[PDB]
Amino acid sequence: MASITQLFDDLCEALLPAAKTHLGQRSVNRKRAKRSLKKVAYNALFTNLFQDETQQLQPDMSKLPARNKILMLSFDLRVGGLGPKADRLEELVEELEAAPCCPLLEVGSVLDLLVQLAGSGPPQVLPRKRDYFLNNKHVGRNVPYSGYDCDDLSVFEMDVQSLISREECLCHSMIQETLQVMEAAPGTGLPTVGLFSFGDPCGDRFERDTRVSLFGALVHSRTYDMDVRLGLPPVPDNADLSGLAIKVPPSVLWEAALTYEASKRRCWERVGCPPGHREEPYLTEAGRDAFDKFC
């Protein structure tokens, strides 16, 4: 058997993101990421290893047979209208469970993982084109006598409408994305940042100040906007009164709930909720604490 370290290494390698064609920094990032991902993976692997018993996850479904979880998913799929898919999934699950000689020792545990992997799989599923024979309701040897009910016809119409709408949505999205790319600010969105542009001076404070000062041209202002109308500070109103001072720069469940009993006490002063309201004794008689309060 592979070592757990080896199996986790293989898992991290397969799960490593496919490197974007950017050659250089991603290789070193990939080696470091492999180490970091291993650390993250081990943190997840041992999440419960040093977790106090108090974070006992809900015991209910974990103790359920994997078959029961699969049946639950099948019921949801049928409710989801994927009846034929639910039937096929049930058939395949029954076949997997029925296999008398599973070559895997943890095939039951594998199924349990798959239940634990429920919702963990990859998803646009191009809608299953209607096989000409599948919608061939009136192509058969033993056609049952049916009414004229076109419910399936309405479903097919909706499916075709969905297909057309999906193609239209894809067209609209492609248009919007292409315009949005085409709509970037002049000189913005270029793939070679700074090679054909004056790179944005976001990094170096000196470069940032140079840009906002226009290489030091600006004296008292800083700006990132290229369309700014340059103005100088207005003449102070007291200049004609006080003269011109040198400006010094600043130095800076319903059924569980059902088992609730309620008071039979009623009154003819109350009709809207006769669940009792505790007359609340008075003059001594409310007990020692009230007597102490009275004292």
């Binding site: 058997m1 592979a2 070592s3 757990i4 370290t5 080896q6 290494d9 070193v28 470091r32 180490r35 291993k38 650390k39 081990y42 943190n43 692997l45 041992f46 419960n48 290893l49 040093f50 018993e53």
Partner: protein
């Protein structure tokens, strides 16, 4: 590249100490837990010979050095020499400042609290480490197995331990120690090689016999059946050519030697077999956890590298455990280095970074912190 000062990982195996940096897949340094001091102080003093060499350096100077092992039968016997060995490892092999790196230390199962305290004192005062932790080697191997409940079988050269662990906590009442490991099997193999007509008498010839054992011995799935096969067929017999070209023949000793794991009397050991030790450890465990311990049996250490040990263990555990008990023996291919891998794994946890004993905590609590701070 963020030069994250890597914590130190030191795997102290019964036979070999393995050390390296956190986030490495294997310890960077692996050397015999041996410190050699020059046999003749006089002649080689002028040639810049050190007064003592440790580990691989002791082996390289074995001709002129008297070797000492500060760890005997898995137990530290010379704390000053062990600290000197660790210092040599750090400064010459790893070439790191321990004051600059957290140090994860490993310990043997049932290490005396006073021994842990002395180790902590040496680590904090000699190496001035900013932080340290002391973990049981078998526990790290268990963490390397991705488990929080189970029994770890750590088998080095000098000592064997059985360490039950439940929900991340070792079960001390069910921990068993066996003073039978690779050294005893090596001596048995040397004996059977001498009986075979290959003379191994020197410590160099003893090491040759050890290498022969490591290369050609294997664990029979059924020791009696393999012995019968070797007696009935030379297919289990092996010839070995000595470096001088002398050919020695080894037969059932290929499987008779590891047969001592099931029948230690075959090596002349009075210890229980691996099956009996496992049974006794299971009985020493809680009945509710016994199923999981059988299901989480991890093999660790260099003495677990024997071929066929897994099948024999499976057979024996199945014959010894309740038929309803789920028994699973985990024999990682790297189980010779499982301790080091587990130490790297353990030390890599983000939540573990708070578990280190800092130098400040050592100075606050002293060597007794090992009994007071590391739980």
């Amino acid at each position: 590249m963020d030069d994250d000062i890597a914590a130190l990982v030191v795997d102290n195996g019964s036979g070999m100490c393995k050390a390296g940096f956190a986030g490495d897949d294997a310890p960077r340094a692996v050397f015999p837990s041996i410190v050699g001091r020059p046999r003749h102080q006089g002649v080689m003093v002028g040639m810049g010979q050190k007064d003592s060499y440790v580990g691989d350096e002791a082996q390289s100077k074995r001709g002129i050095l008297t070797l000492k092992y500060p760890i005997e039968h898995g137990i530290v016997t010379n704390w000053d020499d062990m600290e000197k060995i660790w210092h040599h490892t750090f400064y010459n092999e790893l070439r790191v400042a321990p004051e600059e790196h957290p140090v994860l230390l490993t310990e043997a199962p049932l290490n005396p609290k006073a021994n842990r305290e002395k180790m902590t004192q040496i680590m904090f005062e000699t190496f001035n480490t900013p932080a340290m932790y002391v973990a049981i080697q078998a526990v790290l191997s268990l963490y390397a197995s991705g488990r929080t409940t189970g029994i770890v079988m750590d088998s080095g050269d000098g000592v064997t331990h059985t360490v039950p662990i439940y929900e991340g906590y070792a079960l001390p009442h069910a921990i068993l120690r066996l003073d039978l490991a690779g050294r005893d099997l090596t001596d048995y193999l040397m004996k059977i090689l001498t009986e075979r007509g290959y003379s191994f008498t020197t410590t160099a010839e003893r090491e040759i016999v050890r290498d022969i054992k490591e290369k050609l011995c294997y664990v029979a799935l059924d020791f009696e059946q393999e012995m019968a096969t070797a007696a009935s067929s030379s297919s289990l017999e092996k010839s070995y050519e000595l470096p001088d070209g002398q050919v020695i023949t080894i037969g059932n000793e290929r499987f008779r030697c590891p047969e001592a794991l099931f029948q230690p009397s075959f090596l002349g050991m009075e210890s229980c077999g691996i099956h009996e030790t496992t049974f006794n450890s299971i009985m020493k465990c809680d009945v509710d956890i016994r199923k999981d311990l059988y299901a989480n049996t991890v093999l660790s250490g260099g003495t677990t590298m024997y071929p066929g040990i897994a099948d024999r263990m499976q057979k024996e555990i199945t014959a010894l455990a309740p038929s309803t008990m789920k028994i699973k023996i985990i024999a990682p291919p790297e189980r010779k280095y499982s301790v080091w891998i587990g130490g790297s794994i353990l030390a890599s946890l983000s939540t573990f970074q708070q578990m280190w004993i800092s130098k400040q905590e050592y100075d606050e609590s002293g060597p007794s912190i090992v009994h007071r701070k590391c739980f």
